[PDB]
Scaffold this active site. Structure first.
Site, PDB file in Angstrom:
ATOM      1  N   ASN A   1       0.700 -10.981   6.742  1.00  8.69           N
ATOM      2  CA  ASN A   1       0.265  -9.574   7.090  1.00  8.69           C
ATOM      3  C   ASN A   1      -0.951  -9.118   5.939  1.00  8.69           C
ATOM      4  O   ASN A   1      -0.843  -9.553   4.999  1.00  8.69           O
ATOM      5  CB  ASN A   1       1.612  -8.805   6.682  1.00  8.69           C
ATOM      6  CG  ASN A   1       2.080  -8.507   8.216  1.00  8.69           C
ATOM      7  OD1 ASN A   1       1.756  -9.023   9.138  1.00  8.69           O
ATOM      8  ND2 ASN A   1       3.262  -7.704   8.171  1.00  8.69           N
TER       9      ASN A   1
ATOM     10  N   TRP B   1       2.525   0.033  -1.617  1.00  8.45           N
ATOM     11  CA  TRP B   1       2.936   0.096  -0.105  1.00  8.45           C
ATOM     12  C   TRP B   1       4.110   1.240  -0.099  1.00  8.45           C
ATOM     13  O   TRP B   1       4.806   1.209  -1.046  1.00  8.45           O
ATOM     14  CB  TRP B   1       3.308  -1.092   0.482  1.00  8.45           C
ATOM     15  CG  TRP B   1       4.024  -2.165  -0.679  1.00  8.45           C
ATOM     16  CD1 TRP B   1       5.087  -1.847  -1.591  1.00  8.45           C
ATOM     17  CD2 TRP B   1       3.727  -3.462  -1.056  1.00  8.45           C
ATOM     18  NE1 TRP B   1       5.295  -2.951  -2.256  1.00  8.45           N
ATOM     19  CE2 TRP B   1       4.704  -3.933  -1.840  1.00  8.45           C
ATOM     20  CE3 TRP B   1       2.998  -4.564  -0.254  1.00  8.45           C
ATOM     21  CZ2 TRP B   1       4.810  -5.271  -2.462  1.00  8.45           C
ATOM     22  CZ3 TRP B   1       3.000  -5.762  -0.755  1.00  8.45           C
ATOM     23  CH2 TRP B   1       3.565  -6.305  -1.793  1.00  8.45           C
TER      24      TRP B   1
ATOM     25  N   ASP C   1      -6.317  12.264  -2.492  1.00  7.66           N
ATOM     26  CA  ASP C   1      -6.420  11.653  -0.992  1.00  7.66           C
ATOM     27  C   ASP C   1      -7.009  12.422   0.149  1.00  7.66           C
ATOM     28  O   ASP C   1      -7.651  13.398  -0.416  1.00  7.66           O
ATOM     29  CB  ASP C   1      -5.066  11.081  -0.874  1.00  7.66           C
ATOM     30  CG  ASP C   1      -3.968  12.408  -0.583  1.00  7.66           C
ATOM     31  OD1 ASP C   1      -4.307  13.373  -0.148  1.00  7.66           O
ATOM     32  OD2 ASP C   1      -2.820  12.320  -0.541  1.00  7.66           O
TER      33      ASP C   1
END
Lengths: 461, 440, 140
Positions: free
Chosen positions: B135, B153, B239
Site C-alpha cells: 500500500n 495515518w 492544514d
C-alpha cells in the site's frame, strides 16, 4: 494639470498614451480595441484616424487606476484616500470669453452632428451614442449649477436625447423649469473633452453646499477657468474641446435604445427628452472625449474601482471598524460589496451590512454584502471564498431582507424596482454566535513577509 | 525519471533554480506560496540555510505541470477519459540506494525538512510515499528526534489497516515500514481511489533493511520499524482548511536506515490556506468526476470545485437548462448522487454561457440573474463533515444552493435580459491588425 | 448660567424649583416622591431636610423637558434642535484653585462616606447608591 491637452502630453511621455494612426470605425471598432486594451491593460488611446472622419477620437483615458491618480495630482493610488478625507471633512471660479472653447461656432441649420465621430458601441445598439458629454443645467429658482454624464443617442440631424435619471439634481433642474415657466424652453449646455480636474468632479457626489466647479477645479492646483455660453446665460468649462448648446422642447421625447449596459445586457426601448442643439461651438484641432460600457470590465467600471477608493475614508470615518471596502467590477461595479472589519462583539457584522445598505445613497442598491474579518483580503477571491466556506453556516449566517429598493432596470428582481438583498456574515463567530470551539486560523509572520519582499526581485521568477 | 522530468521542465521555462540561502524554516513556504498564487514555475532552492541538500517544492503549483507530468498537456482532454473507463517491474540496482547509512549514523536533522507555518509543531515531512500487494499512502510525518518521525495515518485507511492486520497476526512484533522521498511523476501521482498514467509498469527495487519494494526513481529512502504501542503527540499543524489542528496522539516510526542518491534532492511541499500545492493537484484529478456526473446528468456542461473553498466545499455547476425549476434538480443531484459531494456546503448553478472556472463570469451571473431571497435554497440539518467547526453541531449543518441560472417564464414575470454578444465579425477584423498596433 | 446655585435660583423664581422643609429619608422615600412628581409633572425638588442628615438632597432637576432647555440657554424646547445642528457641523478651558469646590478637604481615615445622604432607591437594592457623580479619568 492645466487643460486637457496639457494632461494628454504627460501620459504620451511616460508610455501612458498611445498613438493609433490606422483607419478606425466609430461604429463598434474603436470600442472592440479599447476593450482588448482595458481587459489586459494597455494605455489610453487617441485615434487621429476615424474611418471616413478627421476629428481625433479619445477613449480609455482613465482605463487603469494609475491614469486616474496622475489625473488628480499624484502618482500613488494611495492619495485617492486623501480625495476622500476631503469630502467628509466638508461636513472658486474664474471666467473667460475668447477662451479656447468657442473659437469655432456653428449655429442654426449649419448644425450637423454627423460631422462628429460619435461611437457606435455594441452589436444591436440603436444609433451612435455620445457617451462622454458633461451636461450643464441651471435651476430657475436659485443660481447654483449642476453637472452630469448622460448617454446621448443622436436621433436626428441636430437632435439629441437626454437620458437623465429622474433623481439626478440635473433632471430635477428641468422639472422645476417646466413648473415655474410652463410651455417655456429649457436651456441646457453639454461640454465635451474637458480637463482631468472637472472630469473626475463630474463622476462624483458633492454636498449641495459647494458647486462642482469649485471641488472639481480644486483637485487641480488652479481655480476653474469657465465662460458664458453664446446662446445661453449658463456656464460651460473653458478648457473644453467641443461645446453643445441648445434647449429641450417641452413635451417632446423619442424612443431610446436598445443599448448594451455595463450590466452586460440590452436595455429595452423606453422614451426620454430631446435636447435640440442650436450651436456646436469648438476649437480647431479640437478633440472629442469618448467612452463605452458593457459586460464588465469597462472604463466606468475601472472608473468605479477608482471612485470607491475615494469612498473608503468617508465610510471609515463613520465606521472605524471597517478595515477595507470594495465593489468588484465582476458585479457591475455596484451590485456586490466585500467589507472587512475589526470585529468588536457578536452581532457586529450585521451593524456593518445595514450600514453599507443605507449610509451612502450609492450603496443603497447593493444586492450582496459579504463581511469578513481583517485577515481576509477583500480584493482577492481566494480569501473571500475561503472566508465564506470556512467561517459560515449558510442558513445561520445569511441575512435575507425583502421588499427593499432596487434598480428599476434590474430585471432579476420580482417586481420593477423592488427586490431583496443578501448579507453574508463570514466573520469568525464569537460565543453567543456559536457553541463550538472555533478554529485557530494559520497567520503569517509579518516579519517573514517583510524579509521576503526585499528579496523578491533579486530572486527573479 | 524525476531528474529527467526536472530538466524537461527547466527548458520549457517551468522551473526555477534559486541560489540564495533560504530557510527551510518558514521562508520556503512563504516563497513557494506567493509563487503558487501567480502561476509560478516550480522551485529548486539549491542552497537552503544550514543544509547542503537542495530543496524542491511547488512541483505541482500549475495545472500545466500536472499535465506535463503524465506526458500530455490538456488535463481535461486527458484525465477526463481516465474515468469514462472508471503490474510492476523489479530491478537489481538503483541510484536511490547509492549512499547507505545505518544505526547512530542516521540523523534526520541533516535533511532540510521544512517548518511551513509559524505555530507549527516541529518540522514536517509532507511528500513521503509511505510503503507498507503493498500500500502506498502520502502521510504527514512530524519530526521528533534524530531517528523518529510520527506516522499520521487515520485508522480507516489501507496502510493504517496494514498495521492492525499486523497487531492481529503477530502480537509484540514490530511492523516494517519504508518511505520513499521523491519518485518519478507518474509514481507521485498516486491519488484518487494504482495510477497507470505513463503506461509502462512502475519500476521498484528491494529495500536494503526489509522486505518492501520502493520506487527506483527515489531520491531519498527511509526504512525502519514501528514498535507496537509507541506513540507521540502530533501537532498542532496547519492544514488545507486555513487552520491549525489540535494536539493528537499517533504511532512512532523509527528510522534504522536512510538510503539516498548522491546529489540527493528533497521533495517537500506545504498544505495551508487554499490554494496550496495539493489543492491544485486535487483540482486536476477532479476532472475525473465530470463525465461520471454527466452520464447521470447530461445537462451538465461543467462541474468545478474551486480550491479556494478547500477543494470540496463549494461547487459551481454550468448546465444546459431544460425547463423551469431545473437548477434545483441539479443541486439535489450534487448533494446526493456521488458520496464525495455529500458534504458540499455551497452549490452555485449557472447557465452554460458562463465559465465555471472564472469568478468574473460567475460573479457576473450571480449579480445579474438572481433575486437573492427568490433564488437561494437553504436546507438544514443536513450531513456535514464533523471536523467542520462552522456547523452549529459537529456532524450537522445547512447547505446553500444559489440558482444563478436565467429565469424562464413562471420563474419570473419581468421581460428577462438578453446577453450582449460580441460581433463574430469585429472578432475577425481585429483577429488581424492587433499585432500591428503595438499598444503594449 | 454661571454655577449650579446660580441656575438653581432661576427655577425657584418661576415656580420651577420646590422647597421641601419636611424630614425625608434618602432610603427609598425621596425616590417615591420624585416619581409621583415626575409621573404627573411637578418641579425639581430640594430637600433641606434629609432624615438623620443635614446636607440638602437635590433630585428631579431635569425632570421635565423645560428644565433642560432653560438649562441650555433658551426657553423654547425648539432650540434643542440647535444643540444638534452643532454636533454635526463639527464634522476653551479656564483653571482656578481656592475655587469654591475645595474649600473643605477631608482626607485619609477621616473620610467617612456615611456623612453624605446617598439615595437608597428601590425595595431590594443592595446598599445606598451614588447615582449622579460625574467621573473624570485620564488616559496615561
Amino acid at each position: 494639470y492645466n487643460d486637457l491637452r496639457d494632461f494628454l502630453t504627460l501620459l504620451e511621455q511616460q508610455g501612458e498614451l498611445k498613438r493609433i494612426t490606422l483607419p478606425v470605425d466609430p461604429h463598434l471598432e474603436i470600442t472592440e480595441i479599447a476593450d482588448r486594451t482595458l481587459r489586459a491593460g494597455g494605455p489610453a488611446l487617441l485615434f487621429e484616424n476615424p474611418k471616413g472622419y478627421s476629428m481625433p477620437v479619445l477613449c480609455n483615458l482613465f482605463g487603469t487606476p494609475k491614469r486616474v491618480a496622475m489625473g488628480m495630482g499624484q502618482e500613488d493610488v494611495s492619495a485617492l484616500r486623501e480625495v476622500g478625507k476631503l469630502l467628509a471633512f466638508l461636513k472658486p471660479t474664474k471666467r473667460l470669453r475668447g477662451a479656447p472653447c468657442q473659437q469655432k461656432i456653428v449655429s442654426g441649420d449649419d448644425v450637423d452632428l454627423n460631422r462628429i465621430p460619435i461611437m457606435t458601441c455594441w452589436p444591436e445598439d440603436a444609433a451612435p451614442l455620445i457617451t462622454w458629454g458633461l451636461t450643464v443645467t441651471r435651476g430657475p429658482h436659485k443660481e447654483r449649477q449642476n453637472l452630469g454624464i448622460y448617454r446621448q443617442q443622436l436621433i436626428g440631424k441636430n437632435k439629441l436625447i437626454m437620458r437623465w435619471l429622474s433623481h439626478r439634481g440635473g433632471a430635477l433642474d428641468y422639472q422645476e423649469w417646466c413648473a415655474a415657466h410652463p410651455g417655456e424652453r429649457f436651456p441646457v449646455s453639454v461640454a465635451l473633452g474637458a480637463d482631468p480636474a472637472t472630469i473626475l468632479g463630474a463622476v462624483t457626489p458633492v454636498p449641495d453646499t459647494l458647486s462642482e466647479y469649485a471641488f472639481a477645479g480644486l483637485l487641480r492646483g488652479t481655480k476653474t477657468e469657465v465662460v458664458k455660453c453664446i446662446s445661453n446665460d449658463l456656464e460651460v468649462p473653458a478648457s473644453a474641446e467641443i461645446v453643445l448648446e441648445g434647449y429641450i422642447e417641452q413635451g417632446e421625447t423619442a424612443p431610446e435604445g436598445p443599448y448594451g449596459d455595463h450590466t452586460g445586457y440590452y436595455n429595452e426601448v423606453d422614451s426620454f427628452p430631446v435636447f435640440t442643439v442650436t450651436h456646436i461651438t469648438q476649437r480647431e484641432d479640437a478633440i472629442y472625449h469618448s467612452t463605452y460600457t458593457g459586460r464588465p470590465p469597462d472604463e466606468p467600471a475601472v472608473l468605479g474601482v477608482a471612485l470607491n477608493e475615494v469612498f473608503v475614508p468617508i465610510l471609515q470615518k463613520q465606521f472605524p471598524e471597517i478595515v477595507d471596502f470594495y465593489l468588484p467590477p465582476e458585479g457591475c461595479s455596484y451590485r456586490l460589496a466585500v467589507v472587512t472589519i475589526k470585529k468588536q462583539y457578536a452581532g457586529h457584522a450585521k451593524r456593518v451590512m445595514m450600514g453599507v445598505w443605507s449610509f451612502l445613497r450609492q450603496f443603497m442598491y447593493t444586492k450582496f454584502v459579504i463581511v469578513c474579518d481583517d485577515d481576509v483580503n477583500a480584493r482577492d477571491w481566494n480569501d473571500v471564498i475561503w472566508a465564506i466556506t470556512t467561517r459560515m453556516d449558510p442558513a445561520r449566517d445569511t441575512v435575507l431582507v425583502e421588499n427593499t429598493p432596487i434598480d428599476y432596470l434590474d430585471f432579476a428582481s420580482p417586481v420593477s424596482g423592488l427586490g431583496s438583498k443578501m448579507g453574508l456574515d463570514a466573520t469568525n463567530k464569537w460565543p453567543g454566535e456559536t457553541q463550538r470551539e472555533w478554529g485557530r486560523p494559520i497567520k503569517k509572520d509579518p516579519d517573514v513577509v517583510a524579509h521576503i519582499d526585499a528579496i523578491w526581485d533579486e530572486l527573479a521568477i
